Design a binder for this molecule. Structure first.
Ligand SMILES: [Ca+2]
Ligand SMILES: [Ca+2]
Ligand SMILES: [Ca+2]
Ligand SMILES: [Ca+2]
Ligand SMILES: [Ca+2]
Ligand SMILES: [Ca+2]
Ligand SMILES: [Ca+2]
Lengths: 207, 207
């Protein structure tokens, strides 16, 4: 069975007037003003308001998907003068749809790691991770790619995983023992307009 | 019966990602990738594209309600491992929601009229009309009011009808043979912020 009883509402609305949600409507409404639509449930009456004559629903406040992603409501259609139901009461949901408004955040601002000197190219150093609070199931808003801002050619980072590896042969601890790497995480798959964060990785060569 | 098989899509979208429409969903869908959502009908694949795995629908182009206000599409769902359909083909509509982006347009940029010099106050002169292409059924985007910008105190205008009538033209001791009235038409019921148009009315006096 198809699931139709839902509305989709963009988060973080900043328009001047109220944000339009959609319209409840019974195919028994002849538009003669004898029918009344009633909204109840989570947010009914303040956050979500209805035009009782037409079924039009509006949202009265800017909503944040990361705070609350879905609202469960109920719809009624009744005779205006008797209150007798014309449609059976029915549940429906208002789904808050994601925009890319959260930047990647690294689990640590400073990572500490070691790797042996004279390691072969590709030796594992450390894995960094940036989380993203946007919706991973739609679009690229939460798809993070890693890149090295500081530390090439001594090190590399896997773009999809944040795994840092050695990238230069014959690194001598006696020459330089400590390396400070900076990694960037950018969402939207690293594409134009993506939001970004950075972290610092202090790497010490061992024997 | 409740009419749930509709999505509501704001016209004139200018974002840099595809505008989200909504999601098809079958309660036979176990999120294991075995179901394939299919979109057919008016604009399917060109104006409206679907994620075959999730049922998410996007619009590929800025849409104009005044050009086309509704699209009729069909939803289908097939089982990958059997190749057989799992839902009945089902129609739904994508309804394009209005914004106030059309100003009142007068049927003529220049109207031509005459009125006898010594007519009673309130004599009919000419009716101007400014039409508004926005949605008359939502808000005041298509609610037009007329005012006189030029030609008072000689002529008045009915705010609702655009009917220009004589006012204090008989009290004009400066016997003039030519007059020019300017009417403004403003939508949003005339309230601040609405869009506006104007017209010119050339009036000649007669005996
Ligand atoms: Ca948010
Ligand atoms: Ca993000
Ligand atoms: Ca978000
Ligand atoms: Ca338009
Ligand atoms: Ca419009
Ligand atoms: Ca208008
Ligand atoms: Ca005169």
């Amino acid at each position: 069975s198809w699931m139709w009883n839902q509305f989709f509402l963009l988060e973080e609305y900043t328009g001047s007037d109220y944000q339009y949600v959609g319209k409840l409507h019974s195919d028994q409404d002849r538009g003669d003003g004898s029918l009344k639509y009633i909204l109840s449930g989570d947010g009914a009456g303040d956050l979500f308001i209805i035009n009782e004559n037409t079924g039009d629903i509006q949202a009265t406040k800017r909503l944040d998907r990361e705070e609350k992603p879905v609202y469960i409501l109920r719809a009624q259609a009744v005779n205006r003068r008797t209150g007798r139901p014309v449609e059976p009461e029915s549940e429906f949901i208002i789904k808050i749809h994601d925009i890319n408004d959260n930047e990647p955040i690294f689990t640590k601002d400073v990572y500490t790691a070691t790797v042996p000197e004279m390691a072969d190219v590709g030796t594992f150093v450390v894995q960094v991770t940036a989380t993203d609070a946007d919706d991973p199931t739609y679009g690229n808003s939460a798809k993070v790619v890693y890149s090295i801002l500081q530390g090439q050619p001594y090190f590399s980072v896997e773009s999809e995983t944040g795994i840092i590896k050695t990238a230069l042969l014959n690194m001598d601890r006696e020459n330089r023992e400590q390396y400070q790497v900076v990694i960037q995480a950018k969402d939207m798959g690293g594409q134009m307009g993506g939001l970004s964060g950075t972290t610092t990785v202090n790497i010490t060569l061992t024997d």
